[PDB]
């Protein structure tokens, strides 16, 4: 409990567009980071630290991207650094040190004196999202031991994913045709080990562009989303309700759920 923050939660409250705290930015540029430049997103009107994330987008034709998740995760009480398109990265395991390079740069920023972020960030609390090239990333990342939560979006990788080390939620998009679920998500999600909380949420007729943020998702993609954060990120048990609990398949919009909850202290 003693990293919950902000009210008790409801599903209106989660899929409403934003969350409980005025958001601020802090552009980064390609020319003083490593990772391809990006917006680091903050809350307002906080005290102490909190869990930091990086979003990521790793498709090679991308025309839009995800930063949607930035406002929409810092509104909840995290910082949030989406990272901007960049051809400089493209396969998995380059997108992993993407990754890699962005966390480490998102935790100098707690000690930068410089930083709108100083001091706010909880530097052990770190969570990854990526999309694509940059959710294959996502997953190795999430194999190394250092972040806490993981959040691939229609992930696209060629090796296999047993030793993944963090609570992992894959959002897979039923008619994605960059990464077909078939042979993407789908064995990725079945190769997660049985030692890990894990979700599968498969978006009905879903593109590859289906979990991005933004269009006709957000209610599915918040309630899933923040909560996972929230759960593993802030160990915060008041958003186990939304990932344990209701008949995900029930929603419309979820054409497949696969899960391991309920998931215990």
């Given at each position: 409990?003693?990293?919950?923050?902000?009210?008790?939660?409801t599903?209106?409250?989660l899929e409403?567009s934003?969350?409980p705290?005025?958001?601020?930015?802090?552009?980064?540029?390609?020319?003083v980071?490593?990772?391809g430049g990006?917006?680091?997103?903050?809350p307002?009107g906080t005290?102490?630290?909190?869990a930091?994330?990086v979003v990521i987008?790793?498709?090679?034709?991308?025309?839009?991207?995800?930063?949607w998740?930035?406002?929409?995760?810092?509104?909840?009480?995290?910082?949030?650094?989406?990272?901007?398109?960049?051809?400089?990265?493209?396969?998995?395991?380059?997108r992993?040190?993407?990754?890699?390079?962005a966390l480490?740069y998102?935790?100098?920023?707690?000690s930068?004196?410089?930083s709108?972020v100083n001091?706010?960030?909880?530097?052990?609390?770190?969570?990854?999202?990526?999309?694509?090239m940059?959710?294959?990333?996502t997953?190795?990342?999430?194999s190394?031991?250092?972040i806490?939560?993981?959040?691939?979006?229609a992930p696209?990788?060629?090796?296999?994913?047993?030793?993944?080390q963090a609570?992992?939620?894959?959002?897979?998009?039923?008619?994605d045709l960059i990464?077909?679920?078939?042979?993407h998500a789908?064995?990725?999600?079945?190769?997660?080990?049985?030692d890990?909380?894990?979700?599968?949420v498969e978006?009905?007729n879903?593109s590859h562009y289906?979990?991005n943020?933004?269009?006709?998702?957000?209610?599915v993609?918040?309630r899933?989303?923040?909560?996972?954060?929230?759960?593993?990120?802030?160990?915060?048990?008041?958003?186990?309700?939304?990932?344990?609990?209701?008949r995900?398949?029930?929603?419309r919009?979820?054409?497949?759920?696969?899960?391991?909850c309920?998931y215990?202290?």
């Amino acid at each position: 409990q003693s990293y919950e923050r902000g009210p008790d939660p409801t599903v209106a409250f989660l899929e409403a567009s934003s969350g409980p705290y005025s958001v601020r930015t802090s552009r980064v540029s390609g020319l003083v980071s490593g990772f391809g430049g990006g917006t680091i997103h903050y809350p307002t009107g906080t005290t102490g630290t909190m869990a930091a994330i990086v979003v990521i987008p790793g498709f090679v034709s991308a025309e839009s991207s995800i930063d949607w998740w930035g406002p929409k995760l810092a509104s909840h009480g995290f910082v949030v650094m989406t990272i901007d398109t960049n051809t400089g990265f493209d396969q998995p395991p380059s997108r992993a040190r993407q990754i890699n390079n962005a966390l480490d740069y998102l935790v100098d920023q707690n000690s930068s004196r410089t930083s709108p972020v100083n001091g706010m960030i909880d530097t052990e609390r770190l969570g990854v999202i990526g999309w694509s090239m940059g959710g294959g990333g996502t997953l190795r990342v999430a194999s190394e031991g250092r972040i806490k939560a993981a959040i691939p979006l229609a992930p696209w990788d060629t090796t296999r994913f047993s030793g993944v080390q963090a609570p992992t939620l894959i959002f897979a998009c039923e008619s994605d045709l960059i990464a077909p679920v078939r042979s993407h998500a789908s064995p990725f999600y079945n190769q997660l080990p049985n030692d890990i909380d894990k979700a599968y949420v498969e978006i009905n007729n879903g593109s590859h562009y289906c979990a991005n943020g933004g269009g006709l998702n957000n209610d599915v993609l918040s309630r899933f989303g923040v909560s996972w954060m929230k759960r593993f990120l802030d160990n915060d048990t008041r958003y186990s309700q939304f990932l344990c609990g209701p008949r995900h398949e029930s929603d419309r919009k979820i054409s497949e759920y696969r899960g391991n909850c309920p998931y215990l202290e």
